[PDB]
Amino acid sequence: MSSIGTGYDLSASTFSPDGRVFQVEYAMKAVENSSTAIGIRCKDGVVFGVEKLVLSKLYEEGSNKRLFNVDRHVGMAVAGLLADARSLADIAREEASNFRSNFGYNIPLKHLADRVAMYVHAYTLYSAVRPFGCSFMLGSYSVNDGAQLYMIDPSGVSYGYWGCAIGKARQAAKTEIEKLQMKEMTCRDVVKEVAKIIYIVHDEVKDKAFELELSWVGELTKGRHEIVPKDVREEAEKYAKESLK
Amino acid sequence: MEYLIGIQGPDYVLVASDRVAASNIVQMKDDHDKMFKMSEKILLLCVGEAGDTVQFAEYIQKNVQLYKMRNGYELSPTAAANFTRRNLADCLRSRTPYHVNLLLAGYDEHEGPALYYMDYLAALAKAPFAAHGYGAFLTLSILDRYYTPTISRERAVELLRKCLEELQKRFILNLPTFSVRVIDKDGIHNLENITF
Amino acid sequence: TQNPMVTGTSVLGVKFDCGVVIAADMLGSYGSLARFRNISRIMRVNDSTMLGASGDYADFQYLKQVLGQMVIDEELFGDGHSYSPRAIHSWLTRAMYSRRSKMNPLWNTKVIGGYAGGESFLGYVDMLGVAYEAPSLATGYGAYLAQPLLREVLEKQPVLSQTEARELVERCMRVLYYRDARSYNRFQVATVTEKGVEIEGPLSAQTNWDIAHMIS
Amino acid sequence: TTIAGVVYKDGIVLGADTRATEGMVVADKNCSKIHFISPNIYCCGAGTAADTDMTTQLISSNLELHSLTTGRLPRVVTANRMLKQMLFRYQGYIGAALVLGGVDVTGPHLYSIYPHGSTDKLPYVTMGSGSLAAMAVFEDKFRPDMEEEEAKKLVSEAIAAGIFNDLGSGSNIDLCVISKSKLDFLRPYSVPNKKGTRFGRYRCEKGTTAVLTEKVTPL
Amino acid sequence: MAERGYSFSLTTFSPSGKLVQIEYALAAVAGGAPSVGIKAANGVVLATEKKQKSILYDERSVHKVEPITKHIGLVYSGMGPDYRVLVHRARKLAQQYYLVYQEPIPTAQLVQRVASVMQEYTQSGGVRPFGVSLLICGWNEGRPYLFQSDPSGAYFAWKATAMGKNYVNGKTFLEKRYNEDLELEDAIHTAILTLKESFEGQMTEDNIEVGICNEAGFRRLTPTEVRDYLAAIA
Amino acid sequence: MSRGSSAGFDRHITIFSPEGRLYQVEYAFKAINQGGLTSVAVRGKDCAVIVTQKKVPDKLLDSSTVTHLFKITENIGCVMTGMTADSRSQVQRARYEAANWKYKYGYEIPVDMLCKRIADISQVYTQNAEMRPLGCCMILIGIDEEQGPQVYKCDPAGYYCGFKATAAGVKQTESTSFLEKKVKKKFDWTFEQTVETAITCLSTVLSIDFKPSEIEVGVVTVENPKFRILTEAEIDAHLVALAERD
Amino acid sequence: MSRRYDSRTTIFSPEGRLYQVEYAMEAIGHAGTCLGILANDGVLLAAERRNIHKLLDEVFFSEKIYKLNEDMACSVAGITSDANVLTNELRLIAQRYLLQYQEPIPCEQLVTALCDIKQAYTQFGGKRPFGVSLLYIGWDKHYGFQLYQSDPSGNYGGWKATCIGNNSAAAVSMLKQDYKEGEMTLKSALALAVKVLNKTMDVSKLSAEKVEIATLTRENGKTVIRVLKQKEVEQLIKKHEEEEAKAER
Amino acid sequence: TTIMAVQFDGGVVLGADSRTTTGSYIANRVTDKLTPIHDHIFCCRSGSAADTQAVADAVTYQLGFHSIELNEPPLVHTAASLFKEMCYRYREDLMAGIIIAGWDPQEGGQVYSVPMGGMMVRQSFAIGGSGSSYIYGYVDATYREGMTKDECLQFTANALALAMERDGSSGGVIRLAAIQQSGVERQVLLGDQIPKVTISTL
Amino acid sequence: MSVMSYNGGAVMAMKGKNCVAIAADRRFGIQAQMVTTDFQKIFPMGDRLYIGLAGLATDVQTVAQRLKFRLNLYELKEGRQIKPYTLMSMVANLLYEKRFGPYYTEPVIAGLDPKTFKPFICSLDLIGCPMVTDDFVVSGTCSEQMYGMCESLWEPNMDPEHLFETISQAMLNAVDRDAVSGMGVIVHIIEKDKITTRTLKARMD
């Protein structure tokens, strides 16, 4: 066994003989229970595409909270346990709030990701609070270093990506992103591209029935994180449907 | 002027103490019939003299504190100790926005150091000596004790000295003869002496 | 009743509210006492994609407020996907801050005018140095409130809201009058309009001159 | 009063002061150091209030000994200086300590001036106290920018000596503290141009002319 | 239940009456580098095995005989983190002492104060003791001092003792060879021999550091100076 | 089994195991092998050089954005080795410690002091009952303006030891052994030499040899008053030189 | 019980009765005997130091008997590591008393101040119980020379002869037996102190390396407390020694 | 007192600072080095009263030192300029002085911020502040044409800075000119034993 | 000694070096401005009654400080062999007065004591808060420093005989009192040995 499900997770003050505590490995499993969130980076912004799992059609906007607004240039698309999803949103956001007051300028993503990553690992250390167990992405367009996309997993590892997907179909999705181009092209061409990857990856042993939500954070929306318009969403989706078939 | 009149004459063992009742606010005597002489115990009596607020507030607190010490040791608080103890208390309190300064007299008989009577100044200067007064009266009361006795003459003649000092209280300062609270404090406890 | 001796002042912030837009003119000049150090100066800021803020009086007290309103706005938009903040909560919470700082007797006044729509309603709010919030037909704060606002009031008195053309003639009339009557300022104005996309208002440019009463 | 000046050589600092520490113009002490000794390679010159000057130097003396010992490398002037700066700004100023910080550091040698709240800069001649200006003049005469150790020594002696003749508060003996790359020379009486607590004769009382009436000997 | 919970804790008492924890801490120091300290009574020597082997160690600002203050040095064994905090606090306390008296602290008052601090971790629960045994050297008042402070937070007076790898054998050699009052130079020679018992793999061109404390003061010595003593007696 | 013993409190709350070393601390070293980042740092007289795998698994990642070289002072730099979760948390912590110090001392930090200070902070994490020690190693590079280039390495628990040459990683023992021969037969250093020696020893131990967009080499040279990342342009030049060198 | 519900002092006993204290009492017995005898011009303390080893630096003569105050001294029986925090604490309390009262501090007052800290550690704060019994020796003018015994738990009693350490049961009865009242002098209580210390202890020889002896003696109405140095200690041992020697074969 | 000025190029900037601090009639310090640095891509120039200006700049050292660490190698001017202005408004009573912060940010390559003693930042072609600069106030803007190239900023600045201190009653003593670009800052020295002062009046 | 406020004490201090001892001579007055209630009040105090600190300003902080200095003294003596040096004592009082930065206290410390480790009589005064002054001749100090200081320079060489020094200091203070109004009643002298403190009480007014 590379993990024990009772023994060495009785407290969050543990380590394990390999070097990594089992609670963190379980926290990657928590993200597997939910659907996929993809986010592909341009040089004019980031575009997210998350599939949102639905049980009813009485759902309206601000339901499930797959897209959060961390700042007025920082966007977040999430995947995994929605419960956990709210605290990670707070952690990134509070860091952003102090930053904005004091520094007085747009946040460079290179600093935010490491800074947040410290905090995500910091819950894991403590046994005052349990590790996190949702995974998120930060995608930003700024003049501070351009468009940049990071992914921070519940362990507290931060890495650069032009294309990251976190889910239960993250491995299958990431390979799929690498075959397509989106690296140098505008957010307007890209939106169409984020949608199709979600449909092609979309399996019936890793995901369930979904309504598409996509999001901007780039030059078209003038920095700020907004959800794509319904009209635009439906053209990006219309390509996504065609591309599967 | 410092504060209204007090006259205190230590005998040589006994100490006979008097303060006016007249606790006056605005231009009337509010109280005119109560002792602001406090029984902190039976073996020790403390008599606090000063302003209206600092007298009642500092001593009532001290009293409850005296009792607590008694339980702990299971012997009466030591007299020598009480003399230094009152000096630390009045210096600490003195900075407070509501002003605390006491012209105090500790009288106790202890089975330790012995008898103590304490002269204590308005500059929070502790001294044992025999003959004390309260107010700008401290100068007026200490002075008649230096000449007329060697401060070892009977309590009865001391009372006659006190009557003469009280006549000054009518002349130099404002207080009327009407009421003074008089107590003699010895080893047994306090004895109520006649009002003037 | 108060007014601290201001060092770095923006003298005037003009404001008239219309049907879905607001037209604001904001003084280009930044007087630092008598010397006019900087003209280029736009005092209207972009908080978010459907809000704007324009203030007159001390500019320092303004720069402290713009970041603070930035962190309050950043907390509120997180909750939605594109939710934007209404004018009234941010302006009223800031009102309570200025009422407290007024009581502290060494302080400097600023008076701001917020335009937002975050409700089902377009809100025009003010936080003042004295503090209060109200609606207004046409507004001006600080030095505008003292002298042009009364000219505006005169107009407002039989005709509740003016037309577009008439507001332009007044603007033109107004800049003359401020340079002539108040000191620190200049004629130079920036025209700033806020709409549902953000605030747009390019750099302050010179406009009509007349410090002549030789002709009068 | 309290009049310290220091001047700068490549090694680091030659500190000069007159002796006699004064309460106004009246002596508390007729002959004692005004230039103060911090650990080794770090020295402190003093001006303004004497008392305030002593506690500021002494606090740095502890922090410097600390930084040098943990690192196991030199002492830094900027280090004491900044550590002082942050405490006194929080306090809201009460300094009356003009200190001339001087240390030999890992890279360049670094010389500093501490006013009440500090200034973080590198001077090249510093003088502290109310007589700061009066100290600068001899240096302005006999020192051009960057000299040798021997020359530097003479400028320290010379700045103390012009103050001695002309001032009445410039009084007494010249004390020099040469602190260089790694050594500390405390040459007490570099030049005594006046003798410390002079006496030619004295007049003392004759057997017991003094008031008494009780005596005891506690152990 | 069993003995496991009760005995280990320092949030509550060992049922043995003495704490099984401090004993654990000594084992840590056993797994550490070998360290000897001997008060000659002409000076004090602290010597330790320092891993160079090719000169893989900076000896220009980091050492194993390290000054706390002017005339006090320490040499150590066991856990490395525990010690680093212990050094920095110890120097801090020393500097407070130098500031006030204007004399660098003597070993005998310092160990007692240092012991108060180490006791707090041996009292506090969730907090483990410091797992370093310190050899403190000093020369103050005209007299050399050597003290041993163990992980429990206690201080013991010794003229010569051994720590680190095979301490039992070190203490036996020290009693045997050592005599009251000796010369500081002869004293280094037996200290290098004390190390040599349980060195492990033996000394290269220099794979020891020695520091001396004497009349002029505590100084760690340079790799060359150190090498001269090692030729005399390995 | 494994090091330490489960019995009693030593993973519920941090109280020593029989070994006298915390249960978590001995486990803490194992955490480097989890990481897969194998580093060797070599010290010149003109620069301090660190060479590490940058760990870019695919060019889908951006090679620039992915990093493990951090700028933790004004020209002191470091590299992270070991479990990545531990590594970012240590970096950010080191950075706070770094800024405070720079102000106080008032000048740029010695490499030795910075490593010593992080080593004190990591003991804190060890000691506290909620927390657990860091599983990572920070290898600091920098040129002290007295002594010269210094390469330090801190261990997971917060052990500190001096180093003039160091290696850390999975294959820690092997990397330090290749570098040990090179330290003994010490070459005279220049920008190019020091860099060539660091890469060559790391490439023998692994026996693959690096790509010019998969390693990150970080230097603090005398010519830069900044901490500088070599990037793909510089590394490619040293890499073709290696094959030919010997 | 069948299992303790202790393993912390932030959790408590399965009976609500604290086992840890009984193990602490056993801990004094593990450590060497501490005894106090009363005199009619002083009080003296005799304690067995941790160090028996020949190699002693001997800068300290106080390593279990610490002089706290200008009126009082205390001794340790138990773990040495525990005294160091306690001894510095006792110094603070002892001078604290003087500041307000400025009286020759009574032994009953100092002990009650300390007992407050020991009872809290056992109740909460997650701190392990103490394992030292401390003997406080002092003079007040209101009852005389006094000796008090403090326990790990916070349990106190005034004695005039008491012993703990190296089987407590035997030792207190024996110390009492040989003690006489109103027949005493400082030299003879000291000679006797070594004799009783010898019997409770396994050694039939005893030296100043093994033992450390303190006097508290009142001179010219003020209490001078010293812990004695080794040559002075030896002289009290040799006085006893002739008698001990006759017992032996 | 001193004079500080910052002049714009086409996307570079040229700074000017002078040395002197006066205590009323007697000059306490003139020795003073009031051109420090803070970073290799951001610099600030000090002037005003030496005690007060130093504390604010120094609180800014410590906050500013955190901002370089967080980020990728080259520091942002925009982060640093905010702390300094905010310091002068809060602590207006305690700390007063006017810092001239100039270099490159991480978003462009030409930013001039002034955190004043009255507080307010704007970027412009030329602004001067601190002591005698007030006097040459209209004068920095006219004398050099807005956004002119490097060599022309160097002639205009060096002559004009000699003339600012001359005219300044509390001016005097070496004019230090700095032209800053990218990672490399160059400073030149116009002495105080050489006039280059512009036509002095009767 | 962290004492403060020179009115409501009745303090004047002088220390002179004898030749086998250092003696410190003081008034023993009590005042509130000049209004009193007793002949004697103690201002020089014995911190072990062989090394003394004489604190001058208020009586309250004189006693309190004494006992807190006694807390340091005992630990130092317990920790390392043989009772504290005068050099150590003199700087320890300097450190206590020093800690107060923000709106600093003005005490006038007089430290008087022999070096206990190895003989070295030393007497010291400090100005204001503290700046160190070592004196060996005779020195007078107070906020009315001037009265003692004129006389202090006048009688000694740098070491007149202990008996002679005693009589001269006591007298300098008896004649001062007619010059001042902070002094009435009693002059207290402490000659400080290493096993006796000779105390003389001068006449009462």
Single-letter amino acid, residue E9:
S
The answer to whether residues D135 and D163 touch, using CB atoms and an 8 Å cutoff, is yes
**DSSP per-residue string spanning G164-228:** ESSSHHHHHHHHHHH--SSS--HHHHHHHHHHHHHHHSS-SS--TTTEEEEEEEEETTEEEEEEP
Closest alpha carbon within chain E to F123: E81
CA distances for F179 relative to E214, F184, F210, angstroms? 39, 9, 17
**Residue G196 burial (CB count, 10 A):** 22
Closest alpha carbon within chain I to B138: I37
For chain G positions 139-168, those within 8 Å of chain B (CB to CB) are: 141-142
CATH code (residue I26): 3.60.20.10
The answer to whether residues G24 and G130 touch, using CB atoms and an 8 Å cutoff, is yes
Q: Which residue has the tokens 């989890």?
A: F34
C170-173 CB contacts, 8 Å cutoff, 24+ apart:
C171/C14, C171/C25, C172/C207, C172/C208
How far is Cα C212 from Cα G205, in angstroms, rounded to an integer? 118
Name which CATH class applies to G19-247: alpha beta
Give the distance from residue I2's alpha carbon to the nearest chain D alpha carbon, in angstroms.
Answer: 14
Distance spanning both ends of chain I, measured CA to CA = 28
Closest alpha carbon within chain A to H67: A103
Number of domains in chain D: 1
How far is Cα A75 from Cα F181, in angstroms, rounded to an integer? 51
Q: CB distance E57–F161 less than 8 Å?
A: yes
Q: Which helix (H) or strand (E) holds G163?
A: strand G162-164
Give backbone dihedrals phi and psi of D141, rounded to 5 degrees, phi first: -80, -45
| Chain G residue numbers touching B72 (CB-CB < 8 A) | 109, 112
Whether F93 contacts chain A with CB within 8 A: yes
Q: DSSP code of C146? A: H
Range of the structural domain that residue E37 is part of? 4-232
Give the distance from residue F143's alpha carbon to the nearest chain D alpha carbon, in angstroms.
Answer: 11
Helix (H, G, I), strand (E, B) or coil at D194: coil
**Residue D175 burial (CB count, 10 A):** 25
CATH code (residue D100): 3.60.20.10
CA distances for D199 relative to D194, D195, F129, I22, I172, angstroms? 12, 9, 71, 20, 19
Domain boundaries, chain C: 1-212
Number of residues assigned to chain I: 205
Number of residues assigned to chain D: 219
Give backbone dihedrals phi and psi of I26, rounded to 5 degrees, phi first: -155, 160
Whether F64 contacts chain A with CB within 8 A: yes
Q: DSSP code of B153? A: S
Let me know the angle formed at the C-alpha of F33 by F30 and F37, rounded to the nearest 5 degrees.
140
Written as six digits, the tokens of F216 are 């990150």
Rg of chain G's alpha carbons, rounded to an integer?
Answer: 18
Burial class (CB in 10 A: 0-12, 13-18, 19+), A160: buried
Q: CB distance F74–H72 less than 8 Å?
A: no
The answer to whether residues B36 and B182 touch, using CB atoms and an 8 Å cutoff, is no
β-pairing verdict for I52-56 and F77-82: unpaired
How far is Cα C204 from Cα C186, in angstroms, rounded to an integer? 11
How far is Cα A20 from Cα A14, in angstroms, rounded to an integer? 9
How far is Cα I193 from Cα F25, in angstroms, rounded to an integer? 59
**Residue H25 burial (CB count, 10 A):** 7
Q: DSSP code of F173? A: H
Measured in angstroms, the resolution is 12.8
**Residue G74 burial (CB count, 10 A):** 32
| Chain A residue numbers touching H107 (CB-CB < 8 A) | 105-106, 143-144
How far is Cα I62 from Cα I42, in angstroms, rounded to an integer? 9
| Chain C residue numbers touching A70 (CB-CB < 8 A) | 74, 78
How far is Cα C157 from Cα E132, in angstroms, rounded to an integer? 87
Range of the structural domain that residue D65 is part of? 1-197
How far is Cα H111 from Cα H124, in angstroms, rounded to an integer? 9
Interface test with A, best of C64, C82, C200 (most A CBs within 10 A): C82
Q: CB distance I35–B121 less than 8 Å?
A: yes
Q: Which of D58, D65, D73 sits opposite E69 (nearest CB)?
A: D65
Written as six digits, the tokens of C188 are 């130079």
**DSSP per-residue string spanning H69-122:** HHSSSSPPHHHHHHHHHHHHHHTTTT-----EEEE--SS-S-EEE---SS----
Written as six digits, the tokens of H112 are 């001039």
Whether A62 contacts chain C with CB within 8 A: yes
The answer to whether residues A72 and C73 touch, using CB atoms and an 8 Å cutoff, is yes
Written as six digits, the tokens of E93 are 């306390």
Give the distance from residue E38's alpha carbon to the nearest chain F alpha carbon, in angstroms.
Answer: 24
Whether B142 contacts chain I with CB within 8 A: yes
Closest alpha carbon within chain I to B134: I37
Q: CB distance A143–H67 less than 8 Å?
A: no
Sheet containing strand E154-157, strands side by side: E66-67, E72-78, E132-140, E143-150, E154-157
| Chain E residue numbers touching F29 (CB-CB < 8 A) | none
| Chain A residue numbers touching C198 (CB-CB < 8 A) | 222
Whether I67 contacts chain G with CB within 8 A: yes
Single-letter amino acid, residue B118:
M
Q: Which helix (H) or strand (E) holds I90?
A: helix I86-98
Q: Tell the CATH topology of B1-196.
A: Glutamine Phosphoribosylpyrophosphate, subunit 1, domain 1 (3.60.20)
The contacts of residue H201 (CB under 8 Å, 6+ apart) are none
**DSSP per-residue string spanning chain E:** --SHHHHH-SSS--TTSS-HHHHHHHHHHHTS--EEEEE-SS-EEEEEE---SSS-S--SS--SSEESSSSEEEEEEE-HHHHHHHHHHHHHHHHHHHHHHSSPPPHHHHHHHHHHHHHHHHHBSSSPPP-EEEEEEEEETTEEEEEEEETTTEEEE-SEEEESTTHHHHHHHHHHH--SS--HHHHHHHHHHHHHTT-SS---SS-EEEEEE-SS--EE--HHHHHHHHHH--
Identify the sign of the CA torsion G69, G75, G80, G81.
negative
Residue closest to B119 by CA, chosen among B148, B96, B151: B151
How far is Cα G158 from Cα G106, in angstroms, rounded to an integer? 11
Q: Which of I75, I78, I91 sits opposite E101 (nearest CB)?
A: I91
Give the distance from residue E98's alpha carbon to the nearest chain D alpha carbon, in angstroms.
Answer: 7
The answer to whether residues E79 and F161 touch, using CB atoms and an 8 Å cutoff, is no
Q: Which helix (H) or strand (E) holds I178?
A: helix I162-179
How far is Cα D116 from Cα D85, in angstroms, rounded to an integer? 8
Q: What is the 3-state secondary structure (H, E, C) of G64-80?
A: CEECCCCCEEEEEECCH
How far is Cα H110 from Cα H42, in angstroms, rounded to an integer? 11
How far is Cα G35 from Cα G196, in angstroms, rounded to an integer? 9
Distance spanning both ends of chain E, measured CA to CA = 53
| Chain I residue numbers touching D60 (CB-CB < 8 A) | none
Q: How far is CA E169 from the centre of its chain?
A: 17
Interface test with C, best of H119, H127, H130 (most C CBs within 10 A): H119
Residue closest to A164 by CA, chosen among A78, A238, A92: A78
The CATH number of the domain covering residues in C1-212: 3.60.20.10
The answer to whether residues G183 and G54 touch, using CB atoms and an 8 Å cutoff, is no
| Chain A residue numbers touching F98 (CB-CB < 8 A) | none
Domain boundaries, chain H: 1-202
Give backbone dihedrals phi and psi of D182, rounded to 5 degrees, phi first: -170, 5
Number of domains in chain F: 1
Written as six digits, the tokens of A148 are 């940049």
Whether F120 contacts chain D with CB within 8 A: no
- Report if residue D209 sits inside a domain: no
**Residue F64 burial (CB count, 10 A):** 18
- Report if residue A2 sits inside a domain: no
How far is Cα C138 from Cα C153, in angstroms, rounded to an integer? 8
Residue closest to D29 by CA, chosen among D6, D52, D51: D51
Q: Going along chain B, which residue ranges are E strands? A: 6-10, 15-19, 23-25, 28-31, 37-38, 44-49, 103-109, 115-117, 119-120, 126-127, 132-134, 181-185, 190-193
Q: Which helix (H) or strand (E) holds H181?
A: strand H175-181
Burial class (CB in 10 A: 0-12, 13-18, 19+), G135: buried
How far is Cα I126 from Cα I145, in angstroms, rounded to an integer? 12
Domain boundaries, chain G: 19-247
Written as six digits, the tokens of D61 are 């003396």
- Which letter, b or e, does each residue of E196-232 get, where b requires 16 or more Cβ atoms within 10 Å of its Cβ? bebbeeebeebbbbbbbbbeebbbbbebeebeebbee
The answer to whether residues A156 and A117 touch, using CB atoms and an 8 Å cutoff, is yes
The answer, yes or no, to whether G and C have at least 3 beta-carbon pairs within 8 Å is: no
Residue closest to I86 by CA, chosen among I122, I50, I40: I122
Whether E67 contacts chain D with CB within 8 A: yes
- Total beta-carbon pairs less than 8 A apart between chain F and chain H: 38
Closest alpha carbon within chain G to B82: G101
Residue closest to D124 by CA, chosen among D141, D142, D107, D147: D147
How far is Cα E201 from Cα E49, in angstroms, rounded to an integer? 11
Bridge-partner residues for C199, per DSSP?
A: C194
Q: Which residue has the tokens 């949103």?
A: A89
Q: What is the largest CA-CA distance in chain H?
A: 56
Give backbone dihedrals phi and psi of B49, rounded to 5 degrees, phi first: -140, 140
Written as six digits, the tokens of A139 are 């995608």
Q: Which helix (H) or strand (E) holds B92?
A: helix B79-93
Number of residues assigned to chain G: 249
Domain boundaries, chain B: 1-196
For domain H1-202, the question of CATH label 3.40.50.300 is answered with no
Range of the structural domain that residue A77 is part of? 7-245
CA distances for D97 relative to D45, D136, F187, angstroms? 10, 18, 53
How far is Cα G36 from Cα G64, in angstroms, rounded to an integer? 14
The answer, yes or no, to whether H and F have at least 3 beta-carbon pairs within 8 Å is: yes
Q: CB distance E12–G129 less than 8 Å?
A: yes
How far is Cα A240 from Cα E152, in angstroms, rounded to an integer? 69
| Chain F residue numbers touching H40 (CB-CB < 8 A) | 74, 225-226
**Residue D11 burial (CB count, 10 A):** 18
Distance spanning both ends of chain D, measured CA to CA = 41
Give the distance from residue F246's alpha carbon to the nearest chain A alpha carbon, in angstroms.
Answer: 36
Let me know the angle formed at the C-alpha of B56 by B55 and B60, rounded to the nearest 5 degrees.
120
Range of the structural domain that residue I155 is part of? 2-205
Q: Which residue has the tokens 């002191």?
A: F76
